[PDB]
């Protein structure tokens, strides 16, 4: 084992911005690197386009301007790979005057566009990854990617099949869910069920492949067709390699479509006649040195996977439980969680992520007692009490711990009909009703609703404890050890813990200076993705929480010698080494898939084990088709009680946001040298008392907007219908206009109570 | 049908006849999270435990009051007008249909006192929307 | 009636099925969803007796059927009037089989008798 | 002419007072529940021993939806 | 953005007969989600029906 690819599972997100480095983003390579970075630009900006035009002029473009002082001009700035040739010429044709004219065509196409988040893949030399491959004169690396989309070929997503899988329990899912039938797995029928026979259903799979080397940086498109062999070209992604051998993978443009315009995507996950440009597949490489030594990076221990996903509309807001947490939990047995060792840095992420959900979810801003207690502790510089493991702090830690939902799902229940076939664990807390109402009095809840206030795998079953999200067993074990006082923490951590933000900045510095770049990059690719609830989720779904999907999943080290921060792991997906040519590329289970098929798949020697040995398209085939349908269904789920409002996946698909319009009405202090201050005339702003001025700031700060209303999702206009289904339909075109959340500064909040860093949602609709 | 008429621009939100069929209201649940002052001798203060409410700085306590005061709720969500439940359709027409039964459950706005606003900026008389859905 | 081929070769797999009226939770409260009634009639009186339950058990009267016995001892059983209804007028029965908030006057049940002869 | 038979349904002799009058299988019913009901000694065998309402409960609600 | 609409085709034979062909029957909305649910008035839709003016000029050999 001499070379390995990192990350083992890379992630690229669709976007309509261009696939070029200056106007795209990169998947996180170090966790928590930029959580307070108030300079981020996740939408293509005017300045970026202006700057892109500067680089296209420069030295000897001014020379040629004086030489033919028109196809001369447009051929000499390589912009035709961004905007088609016609418009470029007509721009100048019609009337430095050159810049303004070219800028306008680039702006029409890309201004405010959702930037692509591209994954960088690296070759690491092994002693165990010591250092990135360093090419010398005569060295080259060749990368190969083969990707597919099988959503249109696969089964309906009704709920997670593993909810009925007999298990002894893992770090991610208690055995109680299956054992006590808390949320039975449903059978699922085929999508596009009218195309029969396996041979014809192959047409439902989109696939493509490409190769690039360090000898030529030209970008290569991964282009498939749907249906496969009017056909449609589907750009699944783009790949390029730089002269240092690092491969950069761009997802598609976010184009989803039906074969007929009248086929509307009215279901959250299962829409026949639709395709999207999401994909996933196999990443391999060959290293060839001066001397003629050739090293194939092809086996599952050293090669990699890529998956593409919807955009992250709040990149600096982390899901409370991430896909990396799922990897970490998949290695653990529930029955052994009492052997887990806990540091404070293992529970801080839960408190820190929940605290930061206030920027995307109203309930976590105004209806979350834990966040309000954190604010209380911060206001007196007293957060460090939470790091105290001694008896005098025990009641403080317990009061916080006791508000969290236990993933055993055995609290806040009455056992209904013990000993009968109707034996059932029924919640005595707030349930989430089905939309199919029954005009019979609800049963009054007797137990407080536990945290967090998000729906979960079992949403389909009113009264099941699993309707609501719980941090997974191993993370709950950390919190329970913390509550008990059975946790360690260092004095230097204590010194940086007077507020939650100070400790968060400290922990971010620990990630940044950790020397295992390879493992940090493997974790960074996954820490921004959701790890539940899986219905089906946002990016990936429930197979990821089973150790079965990994060919290797080992704890390696704490993030620093004295600080674990949930640890660093070496993991690898199980891979079918034949990729697109696998005899199992087009396998299914017949008319339905059911948990019985998953049960049969656990034995690696059985006929069903192929379910876990991934071929291209296998990670994303479970997700909604098109993904925009799932995104528009990924919002609030309203209960008969108004508050708190439950939200699905708000860290990546926000639900209640702070719009730019509000930012512009609180960012200024009363002494600002501006003719308009916080949306008032200078004279009105300065004529009011300071007390009232600061109150108006906080009032504007407190106005949170439904994220669905940040573009036209079918509710705009006189007697517009609005409603759930039009959002699904309209998201196919509007996903690119939805508000994107970005940290922004407040230079002098004074005594207004507004933090110096706020997270503001930018869209054209919400801008003023 | 007597509510907001949304434009492509988010703000200001146009409203039809909001003085008599309110559009954005201040629910009882929020009133109960700002009506109290920090020195109140209650086991729960503005929806916080006694201990948390009095452990925080006076400045933070008043900020939390104004945040709650500023949370305004679509009047259409003060009862079940067809948007409640997993995959509920919601929308304009279900509102129309459900109001025939739900009109009697919609939030009713009533003037209520704030005994000591202190420095929070909340007026001594607030107008609070009472319904069963919005009460806590 | 049914070849083993259907299950053996998985020709039409049985689907899972969720509960109707799923928002009513606990067996105790789901009893309200069941409409039931009973009655007795004998050859000594041919007066017809209604079989009338309630749903849920406003509350609506549901005539499940009617029974009468003639002087020869023959029982005549009438079914209901074909009245189906929802608890709210806006709950439409848009599904072929599964409509929450609805009840109908269909029923089925147990028929027993006692013959009492003049000699005891 | 296809013949004449003597047949009787299985009956729960307690009828409306049966302890299985309100029996079910939890959040879903599935073929596994019917498989288990084959065994007359199992906690699912009540499926075959009718109490009032057991014959028609499978049918569409309301029936007029199924008819149309 | 913008769609070509073939409103018809014209050809003239050597005898001077003009033959006019209509379009291909292609109707479409500017967005696929705009459905034509009204019998007559659907916004965002175009079709390839047309009508208009037919004129000619005759030139003889004698000028
Ligand atoms: Mg996020
Ligand atoms: Mg009025
Ligand atoms: Na102590």
PDB file of C-alpha atoms in Angstrom, chain A residues 268 362 365-367 372-373 375-376 379-380 430 433-435 437 459-460 535 633 637-643 648 659 661-662 691 695 698-699 701-703 705 709-710 715-726 751-753 765-766 768, chain B residues 1 5-11 16 27 29-30 33 48 51-52 55-60 62-64 66-74 77-80 83-94 118-121 131 133-136:
ATOM      1  CA  UNK A 268     -41.604  14.557  -2.374  1.00  0.00           C
ATOM      2  CA  UNK A 362     -37.194  29.920  14.381  1.00  0.00           C
ATOM      3  CA  UNK A 365     -33.966  31.236  18.014  1.00  0.00           C
ATOM      4  CA  UNK A 366     -37.000  31.831  20.232  1.00  0.00           C
ATOM      5  CA  UNK A 367     -38.377  28.475  21.452  1.00  0.00           C
ATOM      6  CA  UNK A 372     -31.620  30.463  25.995  1.00  0.00           C
ATOM      7  CA  UNK A 373     -29.601  29.014  28.867  1.00  0.00           C
ATOM      8  CA  UNK A 375     -27.183  32.804  26.052  1.00  0.00           C
ATOM      9  CA  UNK A 376     -27.612  33.338  29.802  1.00  0.00           C
ATOM     10  CA  UNK A 379     -24.018  36.997  29.083  1.00  0.00           C
ATOM     11  CA  UNK A 380     -22.159  36.493  32.379  1.00  0.00           C
ATOM     12  CA  UNK A 430     -46.589  15.865  21.341  1.00  0.00           C
ATOM     13  CA  UNK A 433     -50.262  14.247  12.873  1.00  0.00           C
ATOM     14  CA  UNK A 434     -50.802  12.853   9.445  1.00  0.00           C
ATOM     15  CA  UNK A 435     -52.464  15.256   7.010  1.00  0.00           C
ATOM     16  CA  UNK A 437     -57.289  14.255   9.753  1.00  0.00           C
ATOM     17  CA  UNK A 459     -42.572  10.562  10.857  1.00  0.00           C
ATOM     18  CA  UNK A 460     -45.152   8.406   9.065  1.00  0.00           C
ATOM     19  CA  UNK A 535     -36.766  10.415   5.111  1.00  0.00           C
ATOM     20  CA  UNK A 633     -40.553  19.071   1.051  1.00  0.00           C
ATOM     21  CA  UNK A 637     -43.946  20.153   9.464  1.00  0.00           C
ATOM     22  CA  UNK A 638     -46.665  22.018  11.308  1.00  0.00           C
ATOM     23  CA  UNK A 639     -48.321  20.678  14.408  1.00  0.00           C
ATOM     24  CA  UNK A 640     -51.715  21.769  15.734  1.00  0.00           C
ATOM     25  CA  UNK A 641     -49.693  23.634  18.368  1.00  0.00           C
ATOM     26  CA  UNK A 642     -47.980  26.604  16.726  1.00  0.00           C
ATOM     27  CA  UNK A 643     -44.697  26.468  18.652  1.00  0.00           C
ATOM     28  CA  UNK A 648     -36.571  18.836   8.854  1.00  0.00           C
ATOM     29  CA  UNK A 659     -33.005  38.286   5.135  1.00  0.00           C
ATOM     30  CA  UNK A 661     -33.456  43.346   3.835  1.00  0.00           C
ATOM     31  CA  UNK A 662     -33.282  43.071   7.645  1.00  0.00           C
ATOM     32  CA  UNK A 691     -32.267  53.518  23.390  1.00  0.00           C
ATOM     33  CA  UNK A 695     -34.485  48.743  19.990  1.00  0.00           C
ATOM     34  CA  UNK A 698     -33.086  44.325  17.521  1.00  0.00           C
ATOM     35  CA  UNK A 699     -36.669  44.349  16.205  1.00  0.00           C
ATOM     36  CA  UNK A 701     -32.811  41.490  13.645  1.00  0.00           C
ATOM     37  CA  UNK A 702     -35.701  39.458  15.061  1.00  0.00           C
ATOM     38  CA  UNK A 703     -37.787  39.401  11.807  1.00  0.00           C
ATOM     39  CA  UNK A 705     -38.624  35.021   6.988  1.00  0.00           C
ATOM     40  CA  UNK A 709     -40.700  32.810   0.501  1.00  0.00           C
ATOM     41  CA  UNK A 710     -37.223  33.917  -0.627  1.00  0.00           C
ATOM     42  CA  UNK A 715     -47.526  31.966  -3.742  1.00  0.00           C
ATOM     43  CA  UNK A 716     -46.800  35.277  -5.562  1.00  0.00           C
ATOM     44  CA  UNK A 717     -49.641  37.206  -7.164  1.00  0.00           C
ATOM     45  CA  UNK A 718     -53.315  37.952  -6.611  1.00  0.00           C
ATOM     46  CA  UNK A 719     -55.147  34.758  -5.538  1.00  0.00           C
ATOM     47  CA  UNK A 720     -51.958  32.729  -6.069  1.00  0.00           C
ATOM     48  CA  UNK A 721     -52.480  29.239  -4.653  1.00  0.00           C
ATOM     49  CA  UNK A 722     -49.275  28.740  -2.765  1.00  0.00           C
ATOM     50  CA  UNK A 723     -49.213  25.507  -0.844  1.00  0.00           C
ATOM     51  CA  UNK A 724     -46.957  22.505  -0.559  1.00  0.00           C
ATOM     52  CA  UNK A 725     -47.346  21.022  -4.045  1.00  0.00           C
ATOM     53  CA  UNK A 726     -46.658  24.209  -6.017  1.00  0.00           C
ATOM     54  CA  UNK A 751     -25.891  47.620  23.435  1.00  0.00           C
ATOM     55  CA  UNK A 752     -28.470  46.407  20.886  1.00  0.00           C
ATOM     56  CA  UNK A 753     -27.854  42.730  21.714  1.00  0.00           C
ATOM     57  CA  UNK A 765     -36.644  38.695  -3.536  1.00  0.00           C
ATOM     58  CA  UNK A 766     -35.518  39.370   0.059  1.00  0.00           C
ATOM     59  CA  UNK A 768     -34.843  45.194   0.439  1.00  0.00           C
TER      60      UNK A 768
ATOM     61  CA  UNK B   1     -59.001  35.526   0.977  1.00  0.00           C
ATOM     62  CA  UNK B   5     -51.126  39.481  -1.483  1.00  0.00           C
ATOM     63  CA  UNK B   6     -47.499  38.607  -2.051  1.00  0.00           C
ATOM     64  CA  UNK B   7     -45.380  40.420  -4.598  1.00  0.00           C
ATOM     65  CA  UNK B   8     -42.160  39.218  -6.230  1.00  0.00           C
ATOM     66  CA  UNK B   9     -40.399  41.566  -3.786  1.00  0.00           C
ATOM     67  CA  UNK B  10     -40.651  40.161  -0.252  1.00  0.00           C
ATOM     68  CA  UNK B  11     -41.157  43.485   1.589  1.00  0.00           C
ATOM     69  CA  UNK B  16     -56.034  43.646   2.487  1.00  0.00           C
ATOM     70  CA  UNK B  27     -49.475  35.593  19.825  1.00  0.00           C
ATOM     71  CA  UNK B  29     -47.240  32.472  23.523  1.00  0.00           C
ATOM     72  CA  UNK B  30     -44.942  35.468  22.911  1.00  0.00           C
ATOM     73  CA  UNK B  33     -42.359  35.281  27.096  1.00  0.00           C
ATOM     74  CA  UNK B  48     -37.437  30.584  31.603  1.00  0.00           C
ATOM     75  CA  UNK B  51     -32.665  30.554  37.955  1.00  0.00           C
ATOM     76  CA  UNK B  52     -31.863  31.157  34.285  1.00  0.00           C
ATOM     77  CA  UNK B  55     -28.741  34.590  36.333  1.00  0.00           C
ATOM     78  CA  UNK B  56     -28.532  36.468  33.061  1.00  0.00           C
ATOM     79  CA  UNK B  57     -27.501  40.093  32.819  1.00  0.00           C
ATOM     80  CA  UNK B  58     -30.284  42.668  32.931  1.00  0.00           C
ATOM     81  CA  UNK B  59     -29.287  43.744  29.419  1.00  0.00           C
ATOM     82  CA  UNK B  60     -29.643  40.226  28.023  1.00  0.00           C
ATOM     83  CA  UNK B  62     -34.497  42.820  28.222  1.00  0.00           C
ATOM     84  CA  UNK B  63     -33.083  41.828  24.813  1.00  0.00           C
ATOM     85  CA  UNK B  64     -34.828  38.469  25.049  1.00  0.00           C
ATOM     86  CA  UNK B  66     -37.838  42.424  22.690  1.00  0.00           C
ATOM     87  CA  UNK B  67     -36.911  39.410  20.550  1.00  0.00           C
ATOM     88  CA  UNK B  68     -40.084  37.646  21.685  1.00  0.00           C
ATOM     89  CA  UNK B  69     -42.177  40.820  21.254  1.00  0.00           C
ATOM     90  CA  UNK B  70     -40.893  41.037  17.680  1.00  0.00           C
ATOM     91  CA  UNK B  71     -41.991  37.500  16.651  1.00  0.00           C
ATOM     92  CA  UNK B  72     -45.139  38.043  14.594  1.00  0.00           C
ATOM     93  CA  UNK B  73     -47.188  35.077  13.349  1.00  0.00           C
ATOM     94  CA  UNK B  74     -49.291  34.680  10.189  1.00  0.00           C
ATOM     95  CA  UNK B  77     -51.608  29.841  11.247  1.00  0.00           C
ATOM     96  CA  UNK B  78     -53.507  30.653  14.490  1.00  0.00           C
ATOM     97  CA  UNK B  79     -55.779  27.708  13.710  1.00  0.00           C
ATOM     98  CA  UNK B  80     -55.669  24.666  11.427  1.00  0.00           C
ATOM     99  CA  UNK B  83     -51.480  23.328   6.558  1.00  0.00           C
ATOM    100  CA  UNK B  84     -51.124  21.133   9.735  1.00  0.00           C
ATOM    101  CA  UNK B  85     -49.626  17.671   9.480  1.00  0.00           C
ATOM    102  CA  UNK B  86     -47.049  15.694   7.556  1.00  0.00           C
ATOM    103  CA  UNK B  87     -47.278  16.635   3.845  1.00  0.00           C
ATOM    104  CA  UNK B  88     -50.328  18.847   4.500  1.00  0.00           C
ATOM    105  CA  UNK B  89     -51.132  20.825   1.348  1.00  0.00           C
ATOM    106  CA  UNK B  90     -51.827  24.196   2.953  1.00  0.00           C
ATOM    107  CA  UNK B  91     -52.308  26.964   0.439  1.00  0.00           C
ATOM    108  CA  UNK B  92     -54.978  29.492  -0.464  1.00  0.00           C
ATOM    109  CA  UNK B  93     -57.914  27.270  -1.358  1.00  0.00           C
ATOM    110  CA  UNK B  94     -57.725  24.973   1.663  1.00  0.00           C
ATOM    111  CA  UNK B 118     -38.155  48.618  32.006  1.00  0.00           C
ATOM    112  CA  UNK B 119     -35.635  49.497  29.296  1.00  0.00           C
ATOM    113  CA  UNK B 120     -36.824  46.814  26.852  1.00  0.00           C
ATOM    114  CA  UNK B 121     -38.688  49.164  24.489  1.00  0.00           C
ATOM    115  CA  UNK B 131     -56.158  31.304  20.013  1.00  0.00           C
ATOM    116  CA  UNK B 133     -53.046  26.950  18.691  1.00  0.00           C
ATOM    117  CA  UNK B 134     -50.913  29.993  19.568  1.00  0.00           C
ATOM    118  CA  UNK B 135     -51.171  30.002  23.337  1.00  0.00           C
ATOM    119  CA  UNK B 136     -47.785  28.480  24.235  1.00  0.00           C
TER     120      UNK B 136
END
